[PDB]
Amino acid sequence: HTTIGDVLREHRRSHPGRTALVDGPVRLTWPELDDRVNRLAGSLAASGIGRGDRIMWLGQNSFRVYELIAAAGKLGAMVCVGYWRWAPPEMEFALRDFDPHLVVWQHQEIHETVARTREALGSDDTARWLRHDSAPQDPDGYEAFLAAGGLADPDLDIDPDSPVLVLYTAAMSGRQCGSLLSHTNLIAMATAAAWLGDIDHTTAFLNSGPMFHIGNHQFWGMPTLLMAGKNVIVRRVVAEEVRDLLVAEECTHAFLMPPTVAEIVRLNRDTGHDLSRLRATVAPHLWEGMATTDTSRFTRSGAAAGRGYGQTELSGFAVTAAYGGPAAGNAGRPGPGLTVRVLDTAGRECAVGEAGEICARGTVVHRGYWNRDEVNAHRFRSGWWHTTDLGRREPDGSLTFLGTTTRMLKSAAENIFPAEVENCIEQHPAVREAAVIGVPNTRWAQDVKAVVVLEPDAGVSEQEIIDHCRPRIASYKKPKSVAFAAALPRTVSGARDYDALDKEYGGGGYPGAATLGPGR
Amino acid sequence: HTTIGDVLREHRRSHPGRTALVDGPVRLTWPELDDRVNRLAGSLAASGIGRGDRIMWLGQNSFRVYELIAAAGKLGAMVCVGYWRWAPPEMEFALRDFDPHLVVWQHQEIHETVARTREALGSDDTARWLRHDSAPQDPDGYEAFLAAGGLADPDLDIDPDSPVLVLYTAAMSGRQCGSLLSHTNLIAMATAAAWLGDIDHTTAFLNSGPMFHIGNHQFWGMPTLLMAGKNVIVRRVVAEEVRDLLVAEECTHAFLMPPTVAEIVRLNRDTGHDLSRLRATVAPHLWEGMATTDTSRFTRSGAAAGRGYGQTELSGFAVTAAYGGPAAGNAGRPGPGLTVRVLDTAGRECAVGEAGEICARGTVVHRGYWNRDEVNAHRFRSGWWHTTDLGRREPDGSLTFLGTTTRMLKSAAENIFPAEVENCIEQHPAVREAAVIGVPNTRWAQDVKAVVVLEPDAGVSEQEIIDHCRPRIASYKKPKSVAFAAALPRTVSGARDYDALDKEYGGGGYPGAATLGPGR
Ligand SMILES: C[C@@]12CCC[C@@](C)(C(=O)OP(=O)(O)OC[C@H]3O[C@@H](n4cnc5c(N)ncnc54)[C@H](O)[C@@H]3O)[C@H]1C[C@@H](O)[C@]13C[C@H]4C[C@H](O[C@@]4(C)C1)[C@@H]23
Ligand SMILES: C[C@@]12CCC[C@@](C)(C(=O)OP(=O)(O)OC[C@H]3O[C@@H](n4cnc5c(N)ncnc54)[C@H](O)[C@@H]3O)[C@H]1C[C@@H](O)[C@]13C[C@H]4C[C@H](O[C@@]4(C)C1)[C@@H]23
Ligand code: NA
Ligand code: NA
C-alpha cells in the first residue's frame, strides 16, 4: 500500500524537473525535496525518532511542514501542527498532551509565547527543540540538523494506517484532542479531492490557509502534492503579498475567504496584474472578472459555498453535493471511501426525515484521538465513528447537516468551543459561573459572547472579563461582549439552558442548516 | 477501510430510486440490488461459502456477475469470472486449478462446452452447479437459490485486502494463471478511472466488454458502479443489440474495441439515431462522426489510443499518458497508488535510457496468482511485483513500454501466448512441430499465424489445422493462416528462432514500442 514517502519516491523519478515547493526564496524540485527529506529522516532517526514517535510544529506555514510530514512518514513517525495563534496555556497543554520527542519552533511573531510556554513546562521539558527560522549555522536550528543527515532513503516498510499528521480539534470538553490522520486517510482525501477539484500536475496552490486546519490540506495542499503540482507557501495572509505570489508563481488555486478576496481585488484594481490563472472557488463573484471562475465540481456543485458536511476526523469535507448529483439535502452525499448512517440515541438507524447523529465508516475516518483511549472506545462504538453532529436523510437519499450537539461556535473561520472560554473566565476569582454563546456577526457566522454570574460582593466589568482572557486563550476565542446575570437559566433538570441563553441574550448564527459555508 | 459491499450499502441509502443495473428486462435500483445481494450471500453462506471460498462464473456478461462479486465480497469469498470463450480443455483446466465450491453456469450459447467440460471432470467434480439462465423455479437455478436467502446484510467485517475478483491471464507457460484482485485493488482502480474518464453519477456504461477481462471493469464498469452511474449489460457484442441499447439506455460510454465498431455504425445508418451522447474513446475515427470523441483526460492524452502501460496484475492500465502531462515515453507516468522501477537482471534500478524489467509496488498490485507458490515467490522477489515486460525511463521521467519477454501476441486487446497455440497444434497427429507468430493487422493490431512442420508422409491442410483448434482453444486464439515448412529455424540452446520466423513470414504488430493499443 502506498505511503506519503512513496509519493515523493515516485515524483522524484517521474517529475525530475518540476518544482514541488516554493516558500520565499526557497524553491525545490521533487528530487531536491526528496533528498532533503531523506537527510531530515536521517537526523530524526539519529535523534532516536522511529515508529510511533512524535514531532510538534509550533510555527506559521512553512515548506518545512511538508518536509517534516514526509520525513516523519518515512520513519512511521507523526507530526502535530500546533497553532501559532495559541496562548501559552493552550500551547503548554498541547505539548504536555502530545508529549513530543522533538519540537520545531518559530521565533518570528511568536517568540514570547513560545518562551513563556517552555518556561512553564519547567523540568517536564524533555524534548529537543529546533528553531526553524534560525540563522543557517545555528546548531540548534532545523537547517543544520537537516544538513547533518545522510542522503540515503531510510527505505523502511511503513504501514500506511500509521498516524502521520495530528490536528488538534474537538475541544467540547474544554480541552482539545489531537486527531490522528494516517497516510491512508490523507491519500484517500487527496485522491477524492483531485476528482472534486480537477487537480493535476499543473496545479499550483497557494497555501494561504492555516496548516493547523484540515481545510488547507484538503483544498488543496495534499491533492497538489499527490498529483505532483507546486505548493507555494505564504507565512500569513497579507493581501498584497498574496496578490504578488498569485502572479509570480502563476497560481491556479489559493485558500482565500471572502474578506481577503475583496482586499485583493481592491488593491489590484486597475493595476494591470493578470490574475486570470487563478481558479476562484470561494465567492467567485467578488473577483470582478480578474480570476477565472472554477469549473470543477467543487465550485459548480455548491460545495465551495458550504454544500457538504465533514470534520477533521473524516479527513475534512467528506460529504458534498458534488457526489451523486442533485441533492434535496444541504450536504449532498458521501464520497467514495466513506459510508454514513444517521443513528438515534439507541444506536439504531434513523428513518428518512428523522434527525439523529451523523456517524461514519471508511477509509477517510481518522485513527482516533491521541491519548484518549476511552473517548475513542466510546466515539467508535459499534464500529461507527460518532461525529457529534446532527443530520438526517432526505427522501432522495441525500444528507442534511442540521447543527452540532456541542454548542460549538464558528467565528472568523475558526471553531470555538464554549467550554474553553467558560473555563478561562471561571478561573477569575470574581466569577462564579460563565456561559458562552455565539451571536450573529454583522458579515458572517458568529461573535463570542459570555453571560457571567459574579461571586457575591465581587465586581469586575465587561472589559476586565474580556482582558482577563488575553494571556490565557487564543485571541479569537475571547468574548466580544459580556452580559451579567444573578443566575443562569436552567432546564427542569437543572442543566444550563443554552436555548434560553440564546433566546434571552441574542444568540444565533450557529453552524448548521441556516449557516453553512464560508459566507460572502 | 471501504469494501465492495460498502459501496452497495451506501448507494442503497443515498440513491433509493436510481437504476443501478439494466440487463434485458431486468432493471434494479440500488436498494433492489443490495437486497438481492444480501439474499444471495445468505444462500451462499448456508451452502458453506465463507472467507477464502471460491465461486466460478461460466457465463457471458450478466447483472448476476455484479451480484455475485458483491455477495462473495460481503462474505470475504472471491469470484472468478471465467472465459465463456474457453474451449473445454481450458475450462476444465481452470475449474481444476481454481477448485471452486460453487459454479454458476450459462446454457445459452455455451451448453455444449460446459457439458463436455463437466464430463471430463468425472468424480473430481465436487462443486455445486447453478444455472443462471434457468427457468425461475429450477431448483438447480440461480434465482431459486437466491430467493431462499434472507434479506439481512451479513454485516461481517471483511478485510479489503482479501481477493474478491479472479481473472485468468499470463499463459506464457501454456496455461493461464488466476490473478487475485482485492477489494482495495478494485476500488483504487475505479477511483483512478473516475478521474481519468470524468466518470460520475451521469455515466451510463454499456458493459460490452467481456467481464472475464480487466478492460471492461476498469473502463468503465467499476468506476460507474462506484460513482453510482448506470451499468447496462449486454451478454456479448451483437451489433444490432448494442446499437439499440446505446440508444434506448442513453449510454455515454461502452467498451468497444476496433473490430466491433464498423458494423454498429453500418446498422445505425439504416435508422439514423443520434449517437452523440456516446463518448467514443477507442478508435473514434471508426465511428464515422456519429459518436462524440471523448474529451476526458483518458482520450485527450493519447491513453485511449494505447499510450500507457499495465496488466491485470496491476489492476489494469496503471501507467498512462494522462498522468503527469506530455511524455517522451510512449506510456506516460504512474497513477497515484503505484510506484514503478525498471530493474536490471541483478535487481538494481536501471539508469535513464537503460532497458530492464518493469516492476511495481503499491495499492493496485494484485495479491498474486491463485495456487502458484513458486511463480509468486519468484515474481514478487525483493518486495517488487515483476511484470515480465521490458521498458525504460526517459530523461523527462516518463516511461516507455518496449515489449514483452514472452513473444506474446495481442489481438484486439486479447493476449495470445505462442505456447498455448503451438501446444494445441502439435497435438494434431500429422504435426511434428509448430511455431506461432503474429502478423500485422490494422483493425486487430495483429493476427495469429502458425508455421507448421508436418510429420513425414502425413498430410493436413491449413484449414484443417485451423479447425483442429476449435475444440481445443478459445476461438480468438486460433491461427488465421498456416504456413508449412520443412523445418523451424532453431536457436543454439534448441528454442525456436522467432526472430528468423518473423523476418521470413511477415511477422510484426507485437505490443510494445512499435504497436500500442487494440487496433485502428
Ligand atoms: C473547512 C471546510 C473543510 C473541512 C471540513 C469543514 C466541515 C470544517 O469546517 O472542518 P472542521 O474545522 O473540522 O469543523 C467541523 C465541524 O464543522 C461543522 N460543519 C460541518 N459541515 C459544515 C458546513 N457545511 N458548514 C459549516 N459548518 C460545518 C460541524 O459541526 C463539524 O463537526 C469545512 C467547512 C466548510 O464550510 C468549508 C469552509 C471553507 C473551507 C473549506 O472549504 C470551504 C469553502 C467550505 C470547508
Ligand atoms: C486493456 C487495456 C486496459 C487494461 C490493461 C491492458 C494493458 C491489458 O490489456 O492487460 P492484460 O490483458 O492483463 O495484458 C497485459 C499485457 O499487455 C501488454 N501491454 C501493456 N501495455 C500495453 C499497451 N499500452 N498496448 C498493448 N499492450 C500492452 C503487456 O505485455 C502486458 O503484460 C490494456 C491494453 C491497452 O492496449 C488498452 C486496450 C484498450 C482497452 C484498454 O484501453 C485501451 C484503449 C488500451 C487497455
Ligand atoms: Na472563579
Ligand atoms: Na503431433
As a three-state string, the secondary structure of A463-518 is HHHHHHCCCCCCHHHCCCEEEECCCCCECCCCCECHHHHHHHHCCCCCCECCECCC
How far apart are the C-alpha atoms of B520 and A435, rounded to whole Å? 73
Q: Which of A440, A476, A468 is nearest to A452 (CA)?
A: A468
Helix, strand, or coil here: A292?
strand
Inter-chain residue contact B340 with A7, CB threshold 8 Å: no
DSSP B496: B
| Dihedrals phi, psi of A240, to nearest 5 degrees | -65, -45
Q: Strand B78-81 and strand B54-58: pairing?
A: parallel
How far apart are the C-alpha atoms of A332 and A219, rounded to whole Å? 18
How far apart are the C-alpha atoms of B122 and A346, rounded to whole Å? 55
Residue B169 C-alpha from the chain's centroid: 8
Domain A405-520: which CATH number of 3.10.290.10, 3.30.300.30, 3.90.550.10, 3.50.30.30: 3.30.300.30
Q: Which residues contact A469 (CB under 8 A, 6 or more apart)?
A: A421, A424, A425, A477, A478, A479
Place of cell 486527531: A179
Q: Which of A2, A14, A186, A320 is the best mutation test for B, with the most CBs of B within 10 A?
A: A14
The amino acid occupying position A216 is N
3-state helix, strand, coil in chain B (%, to 5): 35, 25, 40
How far apart are the C-alpha atoms of A164 and A160, rounded to whole Å? 9
Q: CA neighbours within 13 Å on the CB side: how many for B452?
A: 31
Q: Which three cell numbers stand for residue A193?
A: 479531492
- Is B476 in contact with B407 (CB distance < 8 Å)? no
How far apart are the C-alpha atoms of A174 and A407, rounded to whole Å? 12
Q: Strand B414-416 and strand B54-58: pairing?
A: unpaired
Distance B280 CA to ligand 2 centre (A): 18
Place of cell 483526460: B297
A149 lines ligand 1 (CB under 6 A): no
Residues in chain A: 520
Q: Which three cell numbers stand for residue B449?
A: 499465424
A415 lines ligand 1 (CB under 6 A): yes
At B5, which helix (H) or strand (E)? helix B4-14
How far apart are the C-alpha atoms of A302 and A322, rounded to whole Å? 8
Query: What ranges in A276-364 are assigned the alpha helix state H?
Result: 297-300
- Is A279 in contact with A296 (CB distance < 8 Å)? yes
DSSP B497: -
DSSP A350: P
The amino acid occupying position B43 is S
How far apart are the C-alpha atoms of B13 and A342, rounded to whole Å? 11
How far apart are the C-alpha atoms of B159 and B236, rounded to whole Å? 33
In this structure, the number of other CB atoms found within 10 A of the CB of residue A404 comes to: 20
Q: Which of B176, B154, B177, B174 is nearest to B76 (CA)?
A: B154
Residue nearest to atom 33 of ligand 1 (CA): A317
- Is B146 in contact with B36 (CB distance < 8 Å)? yes
In this structure, the number of other CB atoms found within 10 A of the CB of residue A238 comes to: 14
Strand partners, B316: B311
Residues in chain B: 520
How far apart are the C-alpha atoms of A340 and A394, rounded to whole Å? 13
How far apart are the C-alpha atoms of B226 and B194, rounded to whole Å? 9
| Dihedrals phi, psi of B165, to nearest 5 degrees | -130, 130
Q: Strand A409-411 and strand A414-416: pairing?
A: antiparallel
How far apart are the C-alpha atoms of A122 and A151, rounded to whole Å? 36
How far apart are the C-alpha atoms of A370 and B470, rounded to whole Å? 65
| Dihedrals phi, psi of A136, to nearest 5 degrees | -50, -40
Residues of chain A with CATH 3.40.50.12780: 1-404
- Is B353 in contact with B323 (CB distance < 8 Å)? no
| Dihedrals phi, psi of A97, to nearest 5 degrees | -70, -50
Q: Strand A78-81 and strand A54-58: pairing?
A: parallel
A353: left (phi over 0), alpha (psi -120 to 50) or beta: left
- Is B183 in contact with B160 (CB distance < 8 Å)? yes
- Is B33 in contact with B22 (CB distance < 8 Å)? no
- Is A446 in contact with A439 (CB distance < 8 Å)? yes
The amino acid occupying position A495 is A
How far apart are the C-alpha atoms of A85 and A209, rounded to whole Å? 13
How far apart are the C-alpha atoms of A202 and B158, rounded to whole Å? 38
Residues of chain A with CATH 3.30.300.30: 405-520
DSSP string, A433-469: EEEEEEEE-SSSSEEEEEEEEEPTT----HHHHHHHT
Q: Cα dist. A64→A37, A155, A351, B58 in Å?
A: 10, 21, 48, 56
A105: preceding bond cis by omega (within 30 degrees): no
DSSP B122: G
Strands (E), B124-263: 128-131, 163-169, 177-182, 204-207, 230-233, 253-254
How far apart are the C-alpha atoms of B251 and B241, rounded to whole Å? 13
Buried/exposed B432-463: b ≥16 CB within 10 Å, e otherwise = ebbbbbbbebebbbbbbbbbbbbeeeeebeee
B220: preceding bond cis by omega (within 30 degrees): yes
What's the start-to-end Cα distance of chain A, in Å? 41
Furthest C-alpha separation in chain B: 72
Distance A30 CA to ligand 1 centre (A): 31
Q: Which three cell numbers stand for residue B187?
A: 476500488
Cβ-based burial of A4 (10 A; exposed 0-12, middle 13-18, buried ≥19): buried
DSSP string, B247-309: HHTT-SEE---HHHHHHHHHHHHHH----TTSEE-S-GGGGTTSSEEP-SHHHHTSGGGT-EE
How far apart are the C-alpha atoms of B350 and A107, rounded to whole Å? 45
What's the start-to-end Cα distance of chain B, in Å? 41
How far apart are the C-alpha atoms of B217 and B80, rounded to whole Å? 13
Q: CA neighbours within 13 Å on the CB side: how many for A419?
A: 10
DSSP A80: E
Strands (E), B16-169: 19-23, 26-29, 54-58, 78-81, 102-105, 128-131, 163-169
DSSP string, A162-206: SEEEEEEE--TTSS-EEEEEEHHHHHHHHHHHHHHHT--TT-EEE
CA angle A73, A74, A80 (to 5 degrees): 25
- Is A30 in contact with A7 (CB distance < 8 Å)? no
- Is B117 in contact with B88 (CB distance < 8 Å)? yes
How far apart are the C-alpha atoms of B280 and B254, rounded to whole Å? 8
Q: Strand A163-169 and strand A481-484: pairing?
A: unpaired
Q: Which residues contact A461 (CB under 8 A, 6 or more apart)?
A: none
CA angle A322, A328, A331 (to 5 degrees): 45
- Is B511 in contact with B406 (CB distance < 8 Å)? no
Q: Which three cell numbers stand for residue B430?
A: 500429422
A210 lines ligand 1 (CB under 6 A): no
Residues of B near A (CB-CB distance < 8 A)?
1-2, 6-7, 9-10, 13-17, 157, 184, 187, 190-192, 194-195, 200-202, 226-228, 297, 323-325, 333-334, 336-341, 361-363, 393, 396-399
Atom of ligand 2 nearest to the CA of B309: 21
In this structure, the number of other CB atoms found within 10 A of the CB of residue A18 comes to: 18
Q: Which three cell numbers stand for residue B337?
A: 497508488
How far apart are the C-alpha atoms of B117 and B40, rounded to whole Å? 26
Place of cell 459570555: A450
How far apart are the C-alpha atoms of B190 and B184, rounded to whole Å? 10
In this structure, the number of other CB atoms found within 10 A of the CB of residue B305 comes to: 17
Q: Which of A400, A217, A390, A387 is nearest to A307 (CA)?
A: A400
CA angle B267, B272, B277 (to 5 degrees): 95
Q: Which of A410, A361, A413 is nearest to A387 (CA)?
A: A361
Inter-chain residue contact B10 with A334, CB threshold 8 Å: yes
Q: Which residues contact B291 (CB under 8 A, 6 or more apart)?
A: B275, B276, B278, B279, B280, B284
How far apart are the C-alpha atoms of A294 and A279, rounded to whole Å? 5
**Residue B363 C-alpha, separation from nearest chain A C-alpha, in angstroms:** 4
A216 lines ligand 1 (CB under 6 A): no
CA angle B183, B189, B194 (to 5 degrees): 125
Q: Which residues contact A499 (CB under 8 A, 6 or more apart)?
A: none
A401 lines ligand 1 (CB under 6 A): yes
How far apart are the C-alpha atoms of A51 and B248, rounded to whole Å? 57
The amino acid occupying position A58 is L
How far apart are the C-alpha atoms of B286 and A93, rounded to whole Å? 68
DSSP A141: B
The amino acid occupying position B225 is L
Helix, strand, or coil here: B78?
strand
Q: Which three cell numbers stand for residue B78?
A: 472471491
Q: Which of B306, B315, B71 is nearest to B217 (CA)?
A: B315
How far apart are the C-alpha atoms of A515 and B246, rounded to whole Å? 44
Cβ-based burial of B155 (10 A; exposed 0-12, middle 13-18, buried ≥19): exposed
How far apart are the C-alpha atoms of A20 and A22, rounded to whole Å? 7
Q: Strand B292-293 and strand B308-311: pairing?
A: unpaired
How far apart are the C-alpha atoms of B180 and B46, rounded to whole Å? 25
Question: Could you tell me the CATH superfamily of domain A1-404?
Answer: ANL, N-terminal domain (3.40.50.12780)
- Is A204 in contact with A250 (CB distance < 8 Å)? yes
Q: Which of B102, B96, B104, B53 is nearest to B74 (CA)?
A: B53
Q: Which three cell numbers stand for residue A339?
A: 459510508
A369: left (phi over 0), alpha (psi -120 to 50) or beta: beta
Q: Which of A346, A508, A374 is nearest to A437 (CA)?
A: A508
Q: Which of A91, A24, A57, A86 is nearest to A235 (CA)?
A: A24
Cβ-based burial of B500 (10 A; exposed 0-12, middle 13-18, buried ≥19): middle
B191 CB neighbours in chain A (<8 A) are 191-192, 195, 336-337
Q: Which three cell numbers stand for residue A303?
A: 460545495
How far apart are the C-alpha atoms of A94 and A505, rounded to whole Å? 33
Q: Angle of helix B258-271 relative to helix B239-248, nearest 10 degrees?
A: 70
Computed on alpha carbons and rounded to an integer, the radius of gyration of chain B in Å comes to 23
A315: left (phi over 0), alpha (psi -120 to 50) or beta: left
How far apart are the C-alpha atoms of A484 and A476, rounded to whole Å? 21
How far apart are the C-alpha atoms of B146 and B41, rounded to whole Å? 8
Q: Strand A102-105 and strand A54-58: pairing?
A: parallel
Strand partners, B342: B358
At B216, which helix (H) or strand (E)? helix B214-216
Query: What ranges in A331-384 are assigned the alpha helix state H?
Result: 373-379
Q: Which of A310, A316, A287, A303 is nearest to A216 (CA)?
A: A316
